[PDB]
Amino acid sequence: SMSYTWTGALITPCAAEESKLMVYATTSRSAGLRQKKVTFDRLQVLDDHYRDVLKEMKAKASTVKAKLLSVEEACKLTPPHSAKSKFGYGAKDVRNLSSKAVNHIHSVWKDLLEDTVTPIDTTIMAKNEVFCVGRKPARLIVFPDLGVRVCEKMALYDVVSTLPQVVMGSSYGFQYSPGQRVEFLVNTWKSKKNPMGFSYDTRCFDSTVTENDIRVEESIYQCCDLAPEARQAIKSLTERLYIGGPLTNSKGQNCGYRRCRASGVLTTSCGNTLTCYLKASAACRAAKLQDCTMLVNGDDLVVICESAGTQEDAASLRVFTEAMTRYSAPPGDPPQPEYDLELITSCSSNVSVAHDASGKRVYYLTRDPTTPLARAAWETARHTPVNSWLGNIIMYAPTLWARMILMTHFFSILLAQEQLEKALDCQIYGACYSIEPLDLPQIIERLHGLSAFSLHSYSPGEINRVASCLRKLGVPPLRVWRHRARSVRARLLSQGGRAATCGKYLFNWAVK
Ligand SMILES: O=C(O)c1ccc2c(C3CCCCC3)c(-c3ccccc3)n(CC(=O)N3CCOCC3)c2c1
Ligand SMILES: [Mn+2]
């Protein structure tokens, strides 16, 4: 069946968009191009590898006990900036236990328990995301009303935050900080006698997800020891929301129908991860890959296994890809065998090596700096809710480009505007933090360790990537950033107290 059906009505914006300040932001203007790509018929033929893997997953899920969240708990865990309801209240009302919101949520719940069939309305919007140089169309976000979103948490918050790690164990990517992710990848790589590995990523994953896939996920969730009401709400949410439903634009017009994964529901990430893990594990068996270890984050997969030889590996990956295609998930680009861990990119990131103060080799997570640099450029001119600049400083603190360029420029701009002490909103790990730039050394030490302030002797490949990136984007080269940083450092040190702590830790690398 078709992943989508369209009426002709447009995906409209709900606010003023901006598609320029080179660096561009996606808008609703491109929605049609995206719609075209994500619209197709899914063919899926399952086999005994898929069935065997599924049985093993259910047996693990069957050891999980999950509870219902109360309305009040689900309200308190609602993110503060999520879209207001159509029924007269918003996130702030939900979070402060307003009677208007609570009573509507109780009524949505009762309807979920009493009606297990009627498709539930969703809004479809174009995502506004900043990229660098052709242009990629906007991604589509599909989400139901706030009152339903609270009810999803009631039924499934305890399940989605518990079950995946039990079912997928060490392969569940979302349990790891970056250093832990690196540690898993490196320890896995080093455990093989002749390691080979590859990243896989599905072309339009959400659209490849079938009704059967979504019901298989529900059947996994129902293997949990759940309360009777949970079982009913989960079934109802599955039939009425997860398998599909109608789409409405921001102007209240009917855009069409969805028969695939919604990107804006509580189960998107856990569901996608479970479903990719299931198809990928089955595909590894068809491919007959030896001593396979998987790492899964949504539909970004890394597989590390024992090499069978060059031509053998190349053919085994073609068989892997063939099986994934049969299960409904063809790749955006065909996977390639890699014999160097550093060359495997997944979740837009890769492992690299530097050295600590003692001269010990330290592995850390990095990425191509093009998109982070472009996003930071944008947030120099405009201003956003997410502050991707600051998030990247935190998540990629050990990297050469975050330390030399991102930290330098942003502490320079903060010195210049006297806004050192002003908290900024920052979206990291699904949650919205209010971060004080002077809190950064503690945040980085906690997340990465003290060595993040002392790494040096980076790999030549990574230094050159950063250098080619600066050159391509017209930004000063690294020698300029070292000079500027000595100036930023001297400045912070003059200010004493906590600013002197930022100069000491964040810019220890710039000293002679
Ligand atoms: O000359 C500088 O001192 C400087 C400083 C910073 C930047 C940046 C960003 C780097 C990361 C931190 C935020 C600022 C850019 C830049 C980077 C990516 C995409 C667009 C601009 N650029 C490039 C840039 O703004 N342009 C426009 C003017 O001339 C060449 C390209 C920077 C230049
Ligand atoms: Mn994909």
Ligand SMILES: [Mn+2]
């Ligand atoms: Mn992906």
